[PDB]
Amino acid sequence: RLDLSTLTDEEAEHVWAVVQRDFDLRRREEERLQGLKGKIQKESSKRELLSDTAHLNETHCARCLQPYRLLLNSRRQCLECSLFVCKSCSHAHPEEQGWLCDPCHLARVVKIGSLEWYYQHVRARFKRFGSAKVIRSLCGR
Amino acid sequence: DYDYLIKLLALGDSGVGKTTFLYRYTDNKFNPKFITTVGIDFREKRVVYDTQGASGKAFKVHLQLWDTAGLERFRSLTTAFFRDAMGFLLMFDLTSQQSFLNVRNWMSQLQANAYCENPDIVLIGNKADLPDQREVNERQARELAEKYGIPYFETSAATGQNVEKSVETLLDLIMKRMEKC
Numbered sequence: 001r002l003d004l005s006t007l008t009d010e011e012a013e014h015v016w017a018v019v020q021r022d023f024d025l026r027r028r029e030e031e032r033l034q035g036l037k038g039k040i041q042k043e044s045s046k047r048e049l050l051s052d053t054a055h056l057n058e059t060h061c062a063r064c065l066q067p068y069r070l071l072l073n074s075r076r077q078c079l080e081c082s083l084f085v086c087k088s089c090s091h092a093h094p095e096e097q098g099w100l101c102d103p104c105h106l107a108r109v110v111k112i113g114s115l116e117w118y119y120q121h122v123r124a125r126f127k128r129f130g131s132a133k134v135i136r137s138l139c140g141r
Numbered sequence: 142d143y144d145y146l147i148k149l150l151a152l153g154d155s156g157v158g159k160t161t162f163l164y165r166y167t168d169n170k171f172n173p174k175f176i177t178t179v180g181i182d183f184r185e186k187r188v189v190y191d192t193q194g195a196s197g198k199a200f201k202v203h204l205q206l207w208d209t210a211g212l213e214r215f216r217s218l219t220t221a222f223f224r225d226a227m228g229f230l231l232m233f234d235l236t237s238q239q240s241f242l243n244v245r246n247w248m249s250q251l252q253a254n255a256y257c258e259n260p261d262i263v264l265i266g267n268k269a270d271l272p273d274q275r276e277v278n279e280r281q282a283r284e285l286a287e288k289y290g291i292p293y294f295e296t297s298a299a300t301g302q303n304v305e306k307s308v309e310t311l312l313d314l315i316m317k318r319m320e321k322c
């Protein structure tokens with residue numbers, strides 16, 4: 001097992017600190033992703049409700065529901081779910097002449113942002129991540 | 142507040158200039174003091190990454206720059222954090238054929254403690270600002286970097302020479318990996 005006895009204490013005290021900061025970080029990143037996943041469900045269910053309100057997207061933004069004629073920008077189609085939304089609720093996506101609706105945009109930051117590919121290869125080669133391993137080893141004090 | 146959290150880590154011999162290289166990247170400054178890094182440490186920096194297509198879109202990225210210790214007294218601990226990074230800055234000193242010969246040990250060290258056998262990596266030759274004290278044949282370093290199919294960059298934490306460029310190359314290397322999901 002990773003054997004930290006060699007570490008003198010001024011050192012030990014330092015390492016842990018660095019490790020704490022790492023945990024603070026991890027915590028934060030999981031809540032960041034939670035929040036976004038939260039926004040995608042809320043917006044997504046709203047769609048499922050207004051879904052029975054015939055042709056509403058034709059006159060109202062799919063995201064903020066404000067009326068088109070009242071805005072200072074100009075209606076746009078999401079290249080993804082092909083609904084319309086105002087400039088304020090739209091975003092120009094990475095690779096393609098066009099735009100994305102604020103929900104579809106988060107939907108994508110989340111799929112790429114989570115990094116499943118990475119965290120799973122990590123989890124399948126070791127049982128825990130660095131700070132974790134180093135935390136139990138630093139418990140030998 | 143940001144779109145992506147990317148984790149990077151620099152490893153190499155002691156004194157090849159990793160802490161200094163990183164500080165120059167996040168502070169565009171240059172501290173000359175040598176205070177061998179105790180085990181591990183990391184600095185954070187928010188940056189923007191723009192995409193290419195055909196234009197594309199800007200993205201806020203929050204970098205976690207991992208700085209490992211070079212000494213052996215710590216080899217054990219340091220290698221534990223290698224799995225915590227998406228990409229590596231594998232650097233050696235241009236003024237020490239030694240550190241350059243250890244680059245082969247480091248690579249394998251990485252291959253065994255990283256999340257994968259072949260992670261995104263970039264070879265870095267530091268301390269270009271002192272050509273009078275240089276001792277590493279540019280061709281070898283350039284050829285080794287081709288054996289691994291890895292980008293090479295002679296850099297300088299002092300002059301800042303490529304410090305910015307190299308890092309944004311590893312980053313762009315990891316961004317192509319993620320996007321394929």
Ligand SMILES: Nc1nc2c(ncn2[C@@H]2O[C@H](COP(=O)(O)OP(=O)(O)OP(=O)(O)O)[C@@H](O)[C@H]2O)c(=O)[nH]1
Binds near residue numbers: 154172176210212268
């Ligand atoms: N002229 C010049 N000096 C540099 C450069 N980079 C680092 N140095 C110097 O080389 C020394 C070592 O830099 P460090 O960051 O401590 O190297 P290190 O490998 O991270 O130290 P360890 O954590 O023990 O591995 C410092 O005292 C700096 O003054 C550079 O690009 N140019």
Ligand SMILES: [Mg+2]
Binds near residue numbers: 159160161176177178
């Ligand atoms: Mg250092």
Ligand SMILES: [Zn+2]
Binds near residue numbers: 088
């Ligand atoms: Zn709107």
Ligand SMILES: [Zn+2]
Binds near residue numbers: 078080082100104
């Ligand atoms: Zn959409």
